[PDB]
Amino acid sequence: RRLKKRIFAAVSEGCVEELVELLVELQELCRRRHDEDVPDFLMHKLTASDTGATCLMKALLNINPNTKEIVRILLAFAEENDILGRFINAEYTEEAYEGQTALNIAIERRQGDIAALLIAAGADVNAHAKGAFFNPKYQHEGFYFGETPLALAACTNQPEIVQLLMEHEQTDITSRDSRGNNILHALVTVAEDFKTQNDFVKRMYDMILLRSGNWELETTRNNDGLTPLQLAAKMGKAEILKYILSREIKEKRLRSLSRKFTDWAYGPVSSSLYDLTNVDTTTDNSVLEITVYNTNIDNRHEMLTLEPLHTLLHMKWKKFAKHMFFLSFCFYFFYNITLTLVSYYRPRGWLQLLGRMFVLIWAMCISVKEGIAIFLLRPSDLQSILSDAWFHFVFFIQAVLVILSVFLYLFAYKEYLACLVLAMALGWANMLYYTRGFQSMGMYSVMIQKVILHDVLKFLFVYIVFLLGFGVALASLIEKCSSYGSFSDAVLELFKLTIGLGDLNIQQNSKYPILFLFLLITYVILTFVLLLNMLIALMGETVENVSKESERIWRLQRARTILEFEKMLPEWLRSRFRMGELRLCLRINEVKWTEWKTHVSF
Amino acid sequence: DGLTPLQLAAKMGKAEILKYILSREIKEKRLRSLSRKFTDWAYGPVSSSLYDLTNVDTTTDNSVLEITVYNTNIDNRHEMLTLEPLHTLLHMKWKKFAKHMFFLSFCFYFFYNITLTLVSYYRPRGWLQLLGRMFVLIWAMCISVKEGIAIFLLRPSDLQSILSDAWFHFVFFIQAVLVILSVFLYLFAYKEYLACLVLAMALGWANMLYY
Amino acid sequence: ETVENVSKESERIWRLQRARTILEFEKMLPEWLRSRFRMGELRLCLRINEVKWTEWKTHVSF
C-alpha cells in the first residue's frame, strides 16, 4: 500500500541509493513468508495494478543521466529472487498497448546499450505487441511498425540493433505478425514515396535482404495476399518499387536475389533481362494490374514510367490492343451511323428492318457488356475519382434507350421518338470517348469532365438561387390579362437574358414599371456581367491547371484501355506472353544518352 | 488595457511569440510550474500531451481565442488559428454543439424563405394565408431585433473597413424590415405593399449564399 | 486577376469565417448549457494527442 508507490517513484528519477535500500527493504518484506504465493506476491509488489507496467518500463520510459546501473541492479534483484523469467518479458495487461514489453521501449528510446543488456539477459524477441493501438484502422491513430523488435529497430533507423538482432540465434526473420506482415512489409508501410534526401528505408531493406540472403522474405503474402512488391505497388511508394523492380547485385552468392540481369553494355546502349514473376497479368493480382487500377494514390504516372512496366505496356499495345481499339471505334461508328440514318428517315418497309435489327443486336450486346461492367463496380472509390466510371453509365443509358425505343415502336405507342432521338444525341456525344487514342485529344476529352464536375456544377448551384429569386420577384408583380405571365415563362425569359438573347424592353403589363426595370437591370448586372465572367475566370483557371497535366492523364487512360482489352480476351489467344524461361525474364534494351554522358564527363 | 503578455501577443498579431508561449515545455524540476504543455506519453510519431487553458478559451470575457478570431488589424490570423490548443479547440467546439446549430439555423431560414415565396407568389391579385403570413411576421420580428442588437454592438468601425461579415448583418436587417413594412402596409389600405414584398423576397433568396 | 488572386487564398478565408461562426454561436448560448467546458483540473489542461509523421521521420533519419 505504501512500499509499492514508493518503489515506483524511486525507480523513476534515478536515486540509486534510495532504490537499492527500498529493494533490500522489499526483500525483508518478502522474507516474512505469508505462505500464499511466491511469484504473484512479487509481481504484485513490482508491477502496477492499473496499467500493468513493471518497474523496468518505468525505468526506461523516464530516461536520465543515471539510467543504466538502475536497470543493472534491478535485473540483479530480479536475478536474486528467481523471478526474471516472468519479469523481463512481462507485457501490458490493458488492451491499449497490449504486448509492449520492455525490449520495445528499450529499442524505441534510442537506448542501444540497454537493449543489448536486456537481450543478453534473456529477453524474448518473438514478442508481439498485438494491442489495438499498435494495429489501428488508419495511419493517423497509432504507430504501426509490425509489432516485432526487429521491425521496430528497422523502422526507427537503428541499424546497430538490427545487426545485433539478426546475428542472434533465436530471432526468426520471417516471423509474420498479426496482419500477416513480415519485416519487409513493415519497411514498405513505413517508407515515403517522394524522393526525400536521406531515405533510410531503402538502405535498411537492402541490408536486411542481403543479410538474410534468401528468397523467402520476398515472397510471403500477408492476410490480403500481397507480397512486398505488390504491397509497395498498392500503397503507391515509387522509390521502393523502383528499387525492387531493378535490383542488380553483382557478386556471386547474391545473384538469385537479383531481378534485372544486364546482358551487355556498350557506351549508352544496354540490353538487360528483367524478371516478370509478379509483374504481368499472368496471375490474378499483380503489379501492373495494381498500379494501373488504383484510385487511392496520386503518383500512378510516376510508377507507370519505369521498366518493365513501360515496355510491357508498349508491347501489349502494339501487339494486340491497337487493332482491338480501332476495331471497336469502327464498330461504334457504324452503329451510330445506322442509328442516325434510321432516326432521320422515320416513317412520319423492307429497307428499315435491315437497319433496325443491327441496331437492336449491337444495343443488346452493349447493354449486357455494360451490365457486367457495372456489376463489377463494387469498390465505390472508382465513382469518387474521374477515371472512367462515367462512360459505363452513358453507354448503358444509350443502349437501354435504343432497346426501349424499339420495343415501344413495335407496339402501338408513339412515344418512341423521344427515346430514339435522346438515344441518337447521346450516341453522337459519346464518340468523344474514342478521342483517347490520340495525344492532342485526350487533353480535350478530359477537360469537359473536369470543367463540368468542378466549375459548372458549382456556378449552376449558385446561379439557380438568383434565377429563382428574380423569377418569382418578377412574375408576381405582372398583372394577369406581358411576356412574364407565369413563373415558368419568367424563368425562361431570365435564362434568355443571361445568355445575351431576349428583350429588355420596358413595357410589360405591370403596375410598377420602375421597380420592374430596376429588378431587371439588377439581374443583368448580377449574372450577365458579374457571375458569368467570374465563372469564365474559374474555367480558365481549371483549363490552365489541367493542360499542364494532360500527358499523365492520357498515359493512364491508355494503360487502363490496354488492361481492359487484355481482360476481354479468352484463355486461348493469350499465347502472347512475354519470353521463355531463363522466371519469365523479358529482354529489353535501351539507350541512356543523358546518364552515359554525365557519367563519362566526370 | 487589461491584457496579459499572452493576450497582448495575440492582439498585436505576433505568431512566433504566441507559438512559443502556448507550447512551452521545460523539462527540469524547479521550472515546471512555468510550463504550459505537459507531454504525457510519446511513442514514435504518436504523442499525447496536456495543454493549459487559463487564458485561451471563452471562459473569461477577453481571451486568446476571442482575440485572435475577432481581429481585423492583422493579416496572419490563419497563421495563429492553426496551432494548438486553438485548432483542436475549434474542432471540438464545432463538432460538439455548433454544427447542429448552424444546420438548424439554415433549415429555419430555408423554411422562412419558402413560406415568403409561396405567400408572395399567390398574392390575392383568406384563412390559408393568415397561417403563412404570421410565421413570416414572427420570424421577421425575431430576425430584425437580432440584427438590431448585432449592429448596436457594431462600435469599433474597423469591422466595416474589412470584408469580415459586416455586410450580412445589414442585408438580413434590411430584408426583415422590408417584410414587416410590407405586412403593415398590407393590413392597411395601401397598395404599395407589393414593391416591399417582392424586394423582400428577392433579397431573401439572394441571402442564402451566406449559408 | 482578382479571382485568380483570391482562389489561391480561399482556404484561409473559409477557416476564418468558420471560426467566427463558431464563436458567434457560442456567445448565443445562455450561461446554462455551457456545461461543455473542456477538461477538469490538473488550470483546465485540455488533453490532445497527435501524430507528426513528417517531423518524426526527419528527426529519426538523421
PDB file of N, CA, C and O in Angstrom, chain A residues 52 118 137 161 163 196 253-254 360 389 392 444 561 581 584:
ATOM      1  N   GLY A  52      -0.307  -2.240 -15.633  1.00  0.00           N
ATOM      2  CA  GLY A  52       0.447  -3.455 -15.853  1.00  0.00           C
ATOM      3  C   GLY A  52       1.925  -3.219 -16.025  1.00  0.00           C
ATOM      4  O   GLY A  52       2.677  -4.187 -16.176  1.00  0.00           O
ATOM      5  N   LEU A 118      19.527  -6.079 -22.179  1.00  0.00           N
ATOM      6  CA  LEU A 118      18.346  -6.905 -21.947  1.00  0.00           C
ATOM      7  C   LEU A 118      18.375  -8.173 -22.786  1.00  0.00           C
ATOM      8  O   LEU A 118      17.979  -9.242 -22.308  1.00  0.00           O
ATOM      9  N   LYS A 137      -6.922   1.338 -37.228  1.00  0.00           N
ATOM     10  CA  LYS A 137      -7.614   1.267 -38.510  1.00  0.00           C
ATOM     11  C   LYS A 137      -6.928   2.138 -39.556  1.00  0.00           C
ATOM     12  O   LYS A 137      -6.781   1.727 -40.713  1.00  0.00           O
ATOM     13  N   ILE A 161      21.185  -2.020 -33.756  1.00  0.00           N
ATOM     14  CA  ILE A 161      20.368  -3.025 -33.092  1.00  0.00           C
ATOM     15  C   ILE A 161      19.809  -4.025 -34.100  1.00  0.00           C
ATOM     16  O   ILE A 161      19.537  -5.176 -33.747  1.00  0.00           O
ATOM     17  N   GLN A 163      21.634  -5.180 -36.724  1.00  0.00           N
ATOM     18  CA  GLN A 163      22.745  -6.119 -36.844  1.00  0.00           C
ATOM     19  C   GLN A 163      22.903  -6.942 -35.575  1.00  0.00           C
ATOM     20  O   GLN A 163      23.250  -8.127 -35.635  1.00  0.00           O
ATOM     21  N   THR A 196      12.776  12.067 -50.841  1.00  0.00           N
ATOM     22  CA  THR A 196      13.384  12.832 -49.770  1.00  0.00           C
ATOM     23  C   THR A 196      14.889  12.567 -49.774  1.00  0.00           C
ATOM     24  O   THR A 196      15.381  11.658 -50.448  1.00  0.00           O
ATOM     25  N   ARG A 253      26.943 -15.519 -54.974  1.00  0.00           N
ATOM     26  CA  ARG A 253      26.183 -15.966 -53.805  1.00  0.00           C
ATOM     27  C   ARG A 253      25.049 -14.983 -53.478  1.00  0.00           C
ATOM     28  O   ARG A 253      24.140 -15.340 -52.726  1.00  0.00           O
ATOM     29  N   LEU A 254      25.018 -13.801 -54.087  1.00  0.00           N
ATOM     30  CA  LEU A 254      23.836 -12.945 -54.087  1.00  0.00           C
ATOM     31  C   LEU A 254      23.621 -12.603 -55.558  1.00  0.00           C
ATOM     32  O   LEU A 254      23.979 -11.519 -56.022  1.00  0.00           O
ATOM     33  N   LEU A 360     -30.488  -3.148 -83.008  1.00  0.00           N
ATOM     34  CA  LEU A 360     -31.006  -3.846 -81.834  1.00  0.00           C
ATOM     35  C   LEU A 360     -30.024  -4.895 -81.324  1.00  0.00           C
ATOM     36  O   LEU A 360     -29.865  -5.061 -80.107  1.00  0.00           O
ATOM     37  N   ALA A 389     -15.612   5.936 -64.735  1.00  0.00           N
ATOM     38  CA  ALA A 389     -16.869   5.384 -64.259  1.00  0.00           C
ATOM     39  C   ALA A 389     -18.060   6.001 -64.962  1.00  0.00           C
ATOM     40  O   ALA A 389     -19.144   5.414 -64.949  1.00  0.00           O
ATOM     41  N   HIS A 392     -19.233   4.150 -68.612  1.00  0.00           N
ATOM     42  CA  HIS A 392     -20.042   2.946 -68.463  1.00  0.00           C
ATOM     43  C   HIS A 392     -21.514   3.299 -68.297  1.00  0.00           C
ATOM     44  O   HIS A 392     -22.383   2.685 -68.932  1.00  0.00           O
ATOM     45  N   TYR A 444      -8.470  17.138 -74.529  1.00  0.00           N
ATOM     46  CA  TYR A 444      -9.716  17.805 -74.850  1.00  0.00           C
ATOM     47  C   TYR A 444     -10.915  16.975 -74.429  1.00  0.00           C
ATOM     48  O   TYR A 444     -12.029  17.495 -74.348  1.00  0.00           O
ATOM     49  N   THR A 561      -7.089   1.305 -70.841  1.00  0.00           N
ATOM     50  CA  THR A 561      -7.635   0.694 -72.055  1.00  0.00           C
ATOM     51  C   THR A 561      -6.906  -0.594 -72.420  1.00  0.00           C
ATOM     52  O   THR A 561      -7.546  -1.576 -72.824  1.00  0.00           O
ATOM     53  N   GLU A 581      11.620 -19.123 -70.438  1.00  0.00           N
ATOM     54  CA  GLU A 581      12.216 -19.171 -69.112  1.00  0.00           C
ATOM     55  C   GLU A 581      13.732 -19.031 -69.177  1.00  0.00           C
ATOM     56  O   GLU A 581      14.388 -19.473 -70.121  1.00  0.00           O
ATOM     57  N   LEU A 584      10.337 -15.469 -66.107  1.00  0.00           N
ATOM     58  CA  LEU A 584       9.921 -15.158 -67.465  1.00  0.00           C
ATOM     59  C   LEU A 584      10.992 -14.368 -68.201  1.00  0.00           C
ATOM     60  O   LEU A 584      11.300 -14.681 -69.353  1.00  0.00           O
TER      61      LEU A 584
END
